[PDB]
């Protein structure tokens, strides 16, 4: 699941960079805004560079969520050796937060792709 998540996220990041380059062949008009100086060319950490950082959030969230769920093996040996009822409440809250994190991660990925489609047509 870890190797399949990073490979599927890399294909979605390359499609966002290729779609913006194809639509700029008939309009272009740069991509940045004007100011009183000329140092906007060195700050090219977006568009093409932003696709690799946005796609890495899907793979990093899967590794952090799997590490929290796999920590129950180290806590099970101490509870079967205070009362052990504190581990049931903590595992239920972590499972509810991990399941609800999928809806927040999916909405954040769709919000990032909406800004690239509106900026490419303006």
């Amino acid at each position: 699941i870890y190797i399949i998540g990073i490979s599927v996220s890399l294909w979605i990041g390359l499609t966002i960079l290729g779609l913006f380059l194809n639509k700029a062949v008939f309009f272009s008009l740069f991509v940045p805004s004007g100011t009183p100086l000329p140092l906007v060319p060195v700050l090219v950490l977006i568009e093409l560079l932003s696709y690799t950082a946005r796609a890495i959030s899907l793979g990093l969230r899967l590794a952090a969520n799997t590490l929290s769920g796999h920590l129950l093996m180290s806590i099970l040996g101490n509870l079967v050796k205070i009362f052990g009822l504190i581990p049931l409440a903590g595992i239920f809250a972590i499972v509810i937060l991990e399941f609800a994190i999928a809806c927040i991660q999916a909405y954040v990925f769709a919000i990032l792709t909406s800004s690239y489609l509106k900026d490419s047509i303006y």
Partner: protein, 71 residues
Amino acid sequence: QLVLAAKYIGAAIATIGLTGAGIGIAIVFAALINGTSRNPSLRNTLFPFAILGFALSEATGLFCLMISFLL
């Protein structure tokens, strides 16, 4: 023994980034709690920006924790 000693310290110094992720989840909730009492941001409206804004601040702590647990 030099490679095994550096693996234990790699997960300790990398956990210093939890101060930004821990205080970031409370900074977004402090502004939403004080603004909801001004009538009447309750259902949706401010609830969608607080849920989506908390996921962006939590992405720094989730990505930093993967490099410390990979040792």
